[PDB]
Symmetry: C2
């Protein structure tokens, strides 16, 4: 027997919608906050196996969700790919030498997960045993565009004028870098699946900063490459695309070939279910800010969301991560209502 | 004879698309930067008539755009409405006593522009004379939800858990405050129109933080009230709705009754033109980051954007404001190509 999440996604008939909440912050339960106080900061957040397995497992223990995702910073592969970086306190990520020329791109090294992040594959095999097919273990990787965005911008960006200048002035250079991330992230997906991941979620929220026609050129093609390539070696591994602010890109997301599209809360469930087509599955739509409302309110929203999503092909979740100051009770309530739903 | 912008919007046949760029930063030409150095900070940015008329006029002089918007912080009316605030250096806006109870809302005072911001109506009559119907003078006001968002959150927010908690836990209180802003912002629109504004742009980008069904309750209704109320006293005054991140709300924007919807760059022009219906006009769609590309690139994008928008009912513009480090030349190029277009 397979976990609910996997059947729902595969389109198999289910009696209820699998459910789990995102941004399963170790900084929500104050469990990553106590483990974070004991000194490496780069090594503390997304690196070690025992702290990865713990942060990852944090939500599983309290609510036993239908899905548990790997807690690993999507940038982790940078180091092994020859792109030196670190998480500076207050600035977040910072790549020391932002790519800018074809010459810089050529320097980029193809990722080798087993060698560069063996702990990832280990945490996954552990997580797999912990859950004991009572939930689905989800991998997590960064997408080519969002990745290139970080290494070209040098770090977190709010304007992306550097990646866009590269995209809109020297496309060949960016295309070469996007290619490198595609080939490397595909490999990474196979590694995680091979290590216990039963579905892998791909992060490319930054690509929604692009106009659809631009998205069609600097993101879509490379997301599609990963899917096509992975589907070839791991035919049954479900891939989940997550990209907040995709309200204007809905119609093109399915063209990537991903099995499931994670919709943010700005797109109505009914609208999204329609605009995405009927084949793809959808991951939870609820606005994280809804968890700040009355219990009745949260219930109405979960109900509306599941009603509009349909009886199947739906993994209930939020449109984004749990906001920092969310009352734990309203959180428990969400799972209570959610788990008692029957199609 | 009326300015191009007004005819295009009114749906009258035009030979070319009116054009202008947003975020006509006095901090783009370094003209507000030199005037900003000479000491009031609150009084310096959006207050005085001579510095308002100057910042506002900054873009007009260099490129003579088809539209010139009033440079006034949408929060300005707060003071006169009895909601004390100030722009603290580094924190931006800060309301000293964030509304939270029905009691606080009842305290709110109905705005009286002539009395509280006479300089606004003066700068507008001046701007009107300066342009001499060789461009359209555009008013600018904040929308009820975005406004309430600022006064409830206490200032700029990125999570909006306070306004949403109020919306989702104590709706009656928020509805009462939204009502107050609607009635007051309508009055403000009449004042600006009466002072020379030939079209007024309404800012409600924060309402796109709301799920469509939530938007349908805490934004749409009040935007509609303003339009219906204003259309009653100023039947021919075009109203422009601007709300970035509206990709999932497109279909409901027209229901507000606004004459023109400003689309951001995440929604393709063709898609937006279709999803919005055929009656409403549309304000420029170009991604500000495109101005960092090759000239050829910028040209292709302006062309694609105008092609998809149609031959009329379109005010070419960006989807957002000009990014801070934009090469002035690529900016001149945009106007060059833009102004040479003929339907």
């Amino acid at each position: 027997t397979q976990p609910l999440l996997l059947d729902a996604v595969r389109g198999k008939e289910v009696e209820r919608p699998p459910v789990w909440l995102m941004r399963q912050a170790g900084r929500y339960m104050k469990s990553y906050q106590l483990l974070c106080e004991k000194y490496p900061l780069f090594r503390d957040r997304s690196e070690n196996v025992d702290l990865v397995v713990e942060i990852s497992l944090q939500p599983w223990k309290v609510f036993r969700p239908d899905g548990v995702i790997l807690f690993s910073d999507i940038l982790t592969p940078l180091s092994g790919m020859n792109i030196p970086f670190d998480i500076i306190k207050g600035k977040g990520p910072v790549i020391f030498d932002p790519l800018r020329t074809a010459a810089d791109v050529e320097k980029v090294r193809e990722f080798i997960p087993e060698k560069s992040v063996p702990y990832v594959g280990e945490a996954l095999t552990i997580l797999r045993k912990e859950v004991n097919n009572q939930a689905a273990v989800l991998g997590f990787v960064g997408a080519p565009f969002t990745l290139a965005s970080y290494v070209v911008e040098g770090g977190s960006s709010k304007n992306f004028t550097k990646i866009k200048r590269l995209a809109f002035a020297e496309p060949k250079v960016l295309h070469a870098l996007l290619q490198k991330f595609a080939t490397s992230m595909a490999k990474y997906i196979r590694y995680q699946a091979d290590s216990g991941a039963q579905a892998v979620q791909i992060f490319d929220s930054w690509a929604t900063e692009l106009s659809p026609v631009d998205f069609e050129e600097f993101s879509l093609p490379y997301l599609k490459q990963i899917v096509d390539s992975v589907k070839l070696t791991h035919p049954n591994l479900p891939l989940i695309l997550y990209a907040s602010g995709s309200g204007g890109l809905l119609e093109r997301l399915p063209l990537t070939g991903v099995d499931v599209v994670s919709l943010d809360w700005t797109v109505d469930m009914a609208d999204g279910r329609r605009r995405l087509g009927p084949n793809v599955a959808i991951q939870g739509n609820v606005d994280p800010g809804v968890l700040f409302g009355s219990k009745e309110f949260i219930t109405n929203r979960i109900n509306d969301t599941v009603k509009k999503a349909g009886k199947g092909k739906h993994i209930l979740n939020l449109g984004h991560g749990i906001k920092v100051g969310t009352p734990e009770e309203n959180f428990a309530h969400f799972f209570e209502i959610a788990k008692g739903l029957r199609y």
